Structure 1
Amino acid sequence: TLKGQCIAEFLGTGLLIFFGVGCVAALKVAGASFGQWEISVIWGLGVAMAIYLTAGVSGAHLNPAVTIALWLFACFDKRKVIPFIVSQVAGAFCAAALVYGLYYNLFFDFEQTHHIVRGSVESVDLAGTFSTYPNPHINFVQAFAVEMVITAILMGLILALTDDGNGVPRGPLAPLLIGLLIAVIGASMGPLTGFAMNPARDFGPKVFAWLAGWGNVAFTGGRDIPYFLVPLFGPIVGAIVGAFAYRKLIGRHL
């Protein structure tokens, strides 16, 4: 039942953002030690749990990019596409609000101590707690390339790990492996654009940060071209490229 699937997607995406934004809030305003890998493995495993929670019901897309790609290449009911995407974005939204709710004090005490004006260009660093931003040394197009490539790999391997005709089936191991995959993508490519590769994972929380006092920079990142467009469309394009790539170069030869 579509209502029960939307609920699952809502919770799954929210669970996913709870752990992800959470560990990043601990790093930013709680002063917890975290390396590029640890942050990546936490996000990865968080997504793994999200999957174990909802796969049996919704099928666990938990990513607009994944939903659009499954529709175009895995015969996913198009009537289910928008309902899913609205659930995904809504859960990420609420989850971000929940993480902020619990860390509320640390955000303010940190900004006061370090004289950070929320909403200013310098507050993008803490805004990073919720959504992704581009590394200082790269521009809009370079950043678009990154999200595109990595999401392609994400989609491609998600299919590979779930393709029962490819090598020994993984069974209950599938979700976990999808987690570690996300982990390594986040550790190898993360420093460039924050390995968003999920429109819902980035837009929802960005909208939240926008309401919470970060204003326009939550969307622009303090740049000329509004950055939110990259985590929005880059993942979608790449998820399609990846899904196509698998069916052509690997599936076709199974």
Structure 2
Amino acid sequence: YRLLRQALAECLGTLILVMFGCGSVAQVVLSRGTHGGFLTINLAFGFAVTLAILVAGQVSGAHLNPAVTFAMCFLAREPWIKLPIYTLAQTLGAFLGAGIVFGLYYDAIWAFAGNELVVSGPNGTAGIFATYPSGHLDMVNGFFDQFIGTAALIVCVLAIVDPYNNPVPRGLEAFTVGLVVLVIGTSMGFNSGFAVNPARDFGPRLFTALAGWGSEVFTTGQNWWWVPIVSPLLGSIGGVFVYQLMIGCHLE
């Protein structure tokens, strides 16, 4: 089955970027102001996308993003049957990647607040895997951060993918997408990294619910859990319209 081989590549690809991305976030969170800052978090997340694409690019096209997968299906470039398979394959692997990060820092995570698992607060460890609203990053303000961030990601992704452009060889397509992830994190008000990925958010968040953080990861921040899922999906639609209206529709 061709679809099965593409799904396994998406599972391994999302496993690489989540394990590498959330692993660097664990170092900064657990070692408060000692192992680096936000620059290392975005550099690790940005470079992890480059490595993840190179691993699974030749098999499944290296989407590693349900918002990106939704964009190609919306543009009639890929069949709609690939969307549920890729999304489950992208979510399963971010769940697995979060488990590896949990195993790596099992003692440090459990010792952050003594012998308890705290979701949000000063000694909060659930923010390593998922994203939670900040002081100026509430639901209203944070919703537009994912919308604009994902729209910019889709525009840059479609620029290097459109067949009407030059056939960029292998290698100069993961560094570019990895550059977009690094710049988006540095530009937007998100300090977790790769916030424009619904699978990178819901996957590890679902793991934290079963890891021992309880159901509070889904009923906190005025039910914020669905925002990093719906908002990037809307941004993919907006990013597609922006690219098509400006560049896409004029390439005869």
TM over 0.5: yes
Q: 1:33 to 1:124 in 2, by over 3 A?
A: closer
Match of 1:163 in 2: 162
In structure 1, distance between residues paired with 2:31 and 2:192: 23
Identity of aligned residues (%): 41
What is the aligned counterpart of 1:251 among 230, 248, 252? Answer: 248
What is the TM-score with the length of structure 1 in the denominator?
Answer: 0.90
User: What is the CA-CA distance between 1:162 and the residue it aligns to?
Assistant: 2.7
The 5-angstrom pairing of residues 45-64 of structure 1 reads: 45-64=47-66
Contact 1:134 1:194 in 2 (8 A): no
Listed as ranges, the gaps of 5+ residues in structure 1 are none
Match of 1:181 in 2: 180
1:5 counterpart letter in structure 2: Q
User: What is the CA-CA distance between 1:169 and the residue it aligns to?
Assistant: 4.8
1:55 counterpart letter in structure 2: G
In structure 2, distance between residues paired with 1:137 and 1:253: 39
Q: 1:123 to 1:80 in 2, by over 3 A?
A: farther
In structure 1, distance between residues paired with 2:138 and 2:112: 29
In structure 1, distance between residues paired with 2:156 and 2:36: 26
Measured against aligned partners, the alpha-carbon deviations of 1:145-165 in whole angstroms (never above 9, x if no partner) come to 110110000011111133353
Listed as ranges, the gaps of 5+ residues in structure 2 are none
Match of 2:231 in 1: 234
The 5-angstrom pairing of residues 77-96 of structure 1 reads: 77-96=79-98
Q: 1:67 to 1:124 in 2, by over 3 A?
A: farther
Q: Identify the structure with the greater helix proportion.
A: 1
Q: 1:121 to 1:22 in 2, by over 3 A?
A: closer
Q: Tell me how large the CA RMSD over aligned residues is.
A: 2.0
In structure 2, distance between residues paired with 1:120 and 1:198: 21
In structure 1, distance between residues paired with 2:127 and 2:15: 17
Contact 1:123 1:214 in 2 (8 A): no
Match of 2:67 in 1: 65
User: What is the CA-CA distance between 1:124 and the residue it aligns to?
Assistant: 7.7
User: What is the CA-CA distance between 1:252 and the residue it aligns to?
Assistant: 2.3
In structure 1, distance between residues paired with 2:46 and 2:134: 21
In structure 1, distance between residues paired with 2:81 and 2:53: 22
In structure 2, distance between residues paired with 1:131 and 1:66: 19
What is the TM-score with the length of structure 2 in the denominator?
Answer: 0.91
User: What is the CA-CA distance between 1:75 and the residue it aligns to?
Assistant: 2.0
1:47 counterpart letter in structure 2: V
User: What is the CA-CA distance between 1:139 and the residue it aligns to?
Assistant: 2.3
Residue correspondences, number:
248
The 5-angstrom pairing of residues 32-51 of structure 1 reads: 32-51=34-53
